[PDB]
Write a protein that binds this DNA or RNA. Structure first.
Ligand SMILES: [Zn+2]
Length: 253
DNA sequence: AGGTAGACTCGGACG
DNA sequence: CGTCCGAGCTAC
């Protein structure tokens, strides 16, 4: 899931778990657990804590308990569900939080690619994976000025810059390509090559693109070989910043 | 110094 | 049957 979907998960999951108390934590793929390094310590420490809140930073979910925060990243295919301990688990369920009311918060991930870290709440923001995370794209903290300052100081492409979690939080591949198309900027452009006008336009399209998605369709992403919706030129796909990258070679320069 | 590329994690889809 | 893919500690 991308940022807007993670926000939807945050909003919908919270009422399904708030106020529940963890009675057991079962782990079927210990590698998902990144901190504490020992999955048995991870399980032991959460037992007895009650869920108090659920926040989002970038694409990270931050479960707030009594003493600890659980920081979870789902990557592309991770998913949470709340269900009865009496019913068989869905396939690819790797971690289950069992509540005293007989319900469970289950984490599934066919790719086994997501991560979990638990720290005392007051430490979470200054430890991985939240440490050094950039500002929320929809916050005043993410400004043209902030974007301009990062862009001038790097030799990287503008696409690489936008994918950098320290620059802006959780702005995914799809939204990078869409925003660059909407701003009329080629993804392979050196970030430092962007004018003030272009940085302003890019910031504006980033906010509009992800903001529109958060409230509730694609110009380029996955549309290679099909006509641009604005000019009819075939959309092209190449590798930029180590990712599949889609663009219109007429609309973007 | 620290910015930056590479290694790493996985299994479904693809040739 | 190998190769590809991609979000977010190690080593030049
Ligand atoms: Zn076009």
């Amino acid at each position: 899931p991308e940022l807007p979907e993670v926000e939807t998960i945050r909003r919908t999951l919270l009422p399904l778990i708030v106020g529940k108390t963890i009675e057991d934590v079962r782990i079927f793929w210990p590698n998902i657990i990144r901190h504490p390094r020992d999955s048995e310590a991870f399980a032991a420490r959460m037992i007895g804590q009650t869920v108090r809140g659920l926040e989002r930073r970038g694409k990270f979910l931050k479960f707030l308990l009594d003493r600890d925060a659980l920081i979870s990243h789902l990557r592309a295919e991770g998913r949470y569900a709340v269900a009865s301990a009496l019913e068989p688990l869905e396939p690819h369920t790797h971690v289950v939080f069992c509540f005293t009311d007989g319900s469970e918060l289950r984490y599934r991930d066919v790719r086994k690619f997501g991560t979990m870290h638990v720290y005392a709440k007051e430490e979470a923001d200054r430890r991985p994976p939240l440490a050094e995370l950039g500002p929320e794209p929809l916050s005043p903290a993410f400004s043209p000025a902030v974007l301009a300052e990062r862009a001038v100081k790097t030799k990287r492409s503008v696409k690489a810059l936008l994918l950098d979690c320290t620059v802006v939080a959780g702005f995914g591949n799809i939204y990078v390509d869409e925003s660059l198309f909407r701003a009329g900027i080629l993804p392979g452009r050196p970030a430092a090559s962007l004018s003030s006008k272009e940085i302003e336009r890019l910031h504006e399209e980033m906010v509009a693109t992800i903001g529109e998605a958060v409230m509730k369709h694609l110009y380029v992403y996955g549309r290679q070989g099909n006509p641009c919706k604005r000019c009819g030129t075939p959309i092209e796909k190449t590798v930029v910043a180590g990712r599949g990258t889609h663009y219109c070679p007429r609309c973007q320069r």
